[PDB]
Design a protein that fits this description.
The structure is a homotetramer. By secondary structure, chain A is an all-alpha fold. Helices cover 91% and strands 0% of the residues of chain A. Chain A has a single domain, classed as Single alpha-helices involved in coiled-coils or other helix-helix interfaces, CATH 1.20.5. Chain B: This is Homer protein homolog 3. Chain B: It is found in: Cytoplasm; Postsynaptic density; Synapse.
């Protein structure tokens, strides 16, 4: 019955090891979701980047028009 | 009299084809004036809209950049 | 008696001038209207393009909105 | 044999405990981070909502003086 103490700790362990394997899966999921979201964000930035440049050429267009003479 | 008659005519004629040619200009000119007028407006209007757009786009790049920082953040 | 045969060959001159000035002016006004029509069309093309670009930005917007709400 | 299998687990366990309160913590960090990132994202959407509407008016403005034939 301190071959019992032993028994008890062989079980604390297994459950500490069962729990930790629960947290690893949970962490791994968070990192995954994070990557996938950050990338969706970078995709918006890239899109925006391109489409803002075109919006500028358009602005420059209008300005040339406004300041032409006679 | 005999025909000096018929060129004091040829003046008063030319006098009214003139008078006329004048009344037509003072109408062309007024029409030019409303072209120039209208143009000047319309162009100012466009320029104002461009200038507005610029402010609105520079604001949009601060934003691309922010989103960019967010995506890249480690 | 020739005394105003000057005022004829005279008006022969300030008329052919006014004719020239008028068909000029009339030519100015024509290319005024042409410029106008071209400039407006350029403005309409810009507007059209803008709108297509705005419609695109709204989908982008809804996207980001969706990502914000997205609760996992 | 025994006094020693217990000596082993007193640490091996007491170690696994810290290495769990660790994850638990690094996962609370992960979550606090997701909510802060999605909020920034939502703020972008919102800025963007308001600034698009103004862009449309600019637009309609432009359309108006293209059709302004009279």
């Amino acid at each position: 019955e301190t071959q019992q103490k032993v028994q008890d700790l062989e079980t604390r362990n297994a459950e500490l090891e069962h729990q930790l394997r629960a947290m690893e899966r949970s962490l791994e999921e968070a990192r995954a979701e994070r990557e996938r979201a950050r990338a969706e964000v970078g995709r918006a930035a890239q899109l925006l980047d391109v489409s803002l440049f075109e919006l500028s050429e358009l602005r420059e267009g209008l300005a040339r028009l406004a300041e032409a003479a006679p």
